[PDB]
Ligand binder design. Structure first.
Ligand SMILES: C[C@H](COCC(CO)(COC[C@@H](C)OC[C@@H](C)O)COC[C@@H](C)O)OC[C@@H](C)O
Ligand code: NA
Length: 361
DNA sequence: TGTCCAGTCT
DNA sequence: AAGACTTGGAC
């Protein structure tokens, strides 16, 4: 097993931070910083450790906020880790609330060394309109890291941060940010636009569908964003979403040989889903082929869980074998329970057949 | 609770 | 990525 992520902020890293702080600030209280940062370190998760570094710096540095920021600007290029550098935007969000313009400039600078995606959300929470205006300017910045921040920091449902209830409730607030970026030349930016849009589909699917129905999907950057923005709705079999992908029509196919083997497994074994699709159409057709498992849970069953299989074009009268092995074992993100597990085959949003496997007690 | 979603490794 | 997740938010 690899070391846990929290070990990125181990004592050796804290010593590195202190040494580089001494390099930019000879009078730095490195001993006090280390004492403060190390207290209970083993009990701290990775994001607790990240925050702790910022707090420890604030506790021992006898300078004001602008003066400390000057040191931290010099510290940023000396750090040997982009993830570790998250404590720099954290310091701004913690101590910069009453020095807004300076703090915004600091986040724009620091975000290239890691990411200001967590820090900017504290400002969006406490000063939404003021911060939104800044992020609109950032969406037009020359630097792809700054444009990406504009999209990622404003996400309704960013992992490892609180949801932004104000954004989540009103997709028009950030709409112009995403519109500016819908054909961005940066893959980094495009990923963020797509993920922000996928977030929106959890609460306002029709708004995203209407938006993308207005897009020019002949632009391959925009088409790529559309496919990844709509990925949850596609798995749900949403007809408007599948239609945007060219796979909204009912599949003109027959399914043959559908099976799941073995019929009965112990936890830890693999299942094998296989079937053949035969076109019954006079021309090629675009297909989105997924599958779903109805897992047995501690009580009852979970909602059908959809996994991706294949997206492809099936020639007229052609047939295509499809096969997927899946390793069924307890995982951090899924515990399993014994009984009948039903597997459904999905083609352009339609269930075309099912099979079963038994998970033994 | 248990459950589900979500740049790097795989 | 496409899925799990070293980890975290939320229901
Ligand atoms: C915080 C982001 C993403 O983190 C990715 C890494 C990947 O292992 C940790 O994911 C752990 C996983 C359990 O979580 C899932 C994601 C969805 O949260 C950390 O990256 C390690 C290298 C960079 O040190 O990255 C911020 C940026 C400043 O790096
Ligand atoms: Na990984």
């Amino acid at each position: 097993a690899a070391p846990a992520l929290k070990e990125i902020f181990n004592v050796e890293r804290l010593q590195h931070i202190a040494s580089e702080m001494t390099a930019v600030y000879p009078a730095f209280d490195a001993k006090g910083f280390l004492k403060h940062a190390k207290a209970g370190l083993a009990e701290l998760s990775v994001m607790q450790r990240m925050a702790r570094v910022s707090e420890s710096l604030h506790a021992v540095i006898p300078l004001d906020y602008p003066q400390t920021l000057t040191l931290l600007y010099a510290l940023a290029p000396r750090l040997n880790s982009g993830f570790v550098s998250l404590f720099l935007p954290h310091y701004v969000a913690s101590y910069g609330r009453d020095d807004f313009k300076r703090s915004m400039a600091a986040l724009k600078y620091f975000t290239t060394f890691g990411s200001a995606e967590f820090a900017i959300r504290h400002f969006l929470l406490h000063d939404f309109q003021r911060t939104l205006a800044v992020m609109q300017a950032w969406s037009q910045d020359d630097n792809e890291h700054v444009r990406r921040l504009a999209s990622e920091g404003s996400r309704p449902r960013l992992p490892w941060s609180f949801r932004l209830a104000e954004v989540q409730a009103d997709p028009e607030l950030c709409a112009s940010i995403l519109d500016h970026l819908k054909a961005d030349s940066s893959l980094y930016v495009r990923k963020s636009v797509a993920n922000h849009l996928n977030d929106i589909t959890k609460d306002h699917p029709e708004w995203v569908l209407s938006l993308i129905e207005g897009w020019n999907l002949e632009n391959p950057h925009t088409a790529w964003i559309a496919r990844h923005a709509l990925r949850s709705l596609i798995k749900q079999g949403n007809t408007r979403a599948l239609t945007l992908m060219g796979a909204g029509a009912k599949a003109e196919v027959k399914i043959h040989h559908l099976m799941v083997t073995p019929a009965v497994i112990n936890l830890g074994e693999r299942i094998n889903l296989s079937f053949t699709l035969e076109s019954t159409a006079p021309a090629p057709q675009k297909l989105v082929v997924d599958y779903a498992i109805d897992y047995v849970k501690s009580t009852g069953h979970g909602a059908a869980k959809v996994f991706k299989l294949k997206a492809f074009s099936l020639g007229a009268g052609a047939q295509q074998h499809i096969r997927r092995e899946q390793h069924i074992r307890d995982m951090t993100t899924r515990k399993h329970y014994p009984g009948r597990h039903v597997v459904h085959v999905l083609v352009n949003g339609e269930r075309l057949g099912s099979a079963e496997f038994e998970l033994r007690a």
